[PDB]
């Protein structure tokens, strides 16, 4: 019905993908979405288009795309909107992509940062 | 005595710096650190060396450097350790403590779920 697609930067190193995979598995452990997939913008598979099509094939008509990025940048403003076809890959007409906001300066980020500062 | 240095990627766009600024401000509001400074790896000021030097001159000898990055990558494993002189910059008898990134923290899941629902 509805799918969650977590999208991340990707890296020539393996850590960025590992992060998205672990995040997806935890979201799945929460039992909130019928369909959960990940896509990596560059260097690594699944790519963002592959994640969106896999989601569509599993039966999703509304696709929630969450940019797992701390801040807006060209990737969240230009490259990814592009891949998703939101700026001038095929999305069927009965399907809508809903592109969400990045993490930003969430109070919980401050909490994490302070934990890290103390080595926890 | 001890300083907190928040380090971020930087971007040709202003949003990456704005993020670090807001985060530093919120940490400052918590009255946890005597010295709090931000530095940006590229494209923007303060640079990482400038943040560390500011901290040192304000009286810090222990500099907690926290990479405000989601995952390790070449920047957290190579570029930043080198700016910190961990592998332009000359420190002192002072210790830099280079901390860990955010990683797949449960609170990241919480934020992601909020974002999924437009919150
Ligand atoms: O670094 C490499 O050599 C390969 C991977 C890589 C490249 C590709 C390459 O350079 O060949 C890539 C490219 C860059 N990404 C760049 C920027 C961004 N990378 C960003 C992030 C990353 N670039 C990370 C990695 C990459 N960024 C990687 C992964 C890695 O370390 O390999 C990350 C993710 C870091 C994280 O998880 O926070 C971010 C931040 C996203 C956020 O705020 O969450 C930005 C900010 C923006 O989009 O303007 C930019 C800067 C720019 O032109 O604006 C560029 C060109 C300069 C650079 O290598 O740093």
Curated annotation (Swiss-Prot), chain A:
One of its GO terms (molecular function) is nickel cation binding. GO terms for biological process: anaerobic cobalamin biosynthetic process; methanogenesis. Its EC number is 4.99.1.3, 4.99.1.11. The active site is at 9 (proton acceptor). Ni(2+) binds at residues 9, 75. Substrate binds at residues 45, 70-75. The keyword Lyase applies. SUPFAM superfamilies: Chelatase. Keywords: Cobalamin biosynthesis, Cobalt, Lyase, Metal-binding, Methanogenesis, Nickel. It catalyses: Co-sirohydrochlorin + 2 H(+) = sirohydrochlorin + Co(2+); Ni-sirohydrochlorin + 2 H(+) = sirohydrochlorin + Ni(2+). Pathway: Cofactor biosynthesis; adenosylcobalamin biosynthesis; cob(II)yrinate a,c-diamide from sirohydrochlorin (anaerobic route): step 1/10. Belongs to the CbiX family. CbiXS subfamily. Catalyzes the insertion of Co(2+) into sirohydrochlorin as part of the anaerobic pathway to cobalamin biosynthesis. Involved in the biosynthesis of the unique nickel-containing tetrapyrrole coenzyme F430, the prosthetic group of methyl-coenzyme M reductase (MCR), which plays a key role in methanogenesis and anaerobic methane oxidation. Catalyzes the insertion of Ni(2+) into sirohydrochlorin to yield Ni-sirohydrochlorin. Homotetramer; dimer of dimers. This is Sirohydrochlorin cobaltochelatase.
């Amino acid at each position: 019905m509805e799918a969650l697609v977590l999208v991340g930067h990707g890296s020539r190193l393996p850590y960025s993908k590992e992060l998205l995979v672990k995040l997806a598995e935890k979201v799945k452990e929460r039992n909130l979405f019928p369909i959960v997939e990940i896509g990596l913008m560059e260097f690594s598979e699944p790519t963002i288009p592959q994640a969106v099509k896999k989601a569509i094939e599993q039966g999703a008509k509304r696709i929630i795309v969450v940019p797992v990025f701390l801040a807006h940048g060209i990737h969240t403003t230009r490259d990814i909107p592009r891949l998703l076809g939101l700026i001038e890959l095929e999305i069927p007409e009965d399907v809508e992509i809903i592109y969400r906001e990045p993490i930003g300066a969430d109070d919980r980020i401050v909490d994490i940062i302070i934990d890290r500062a103390f080595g926890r």
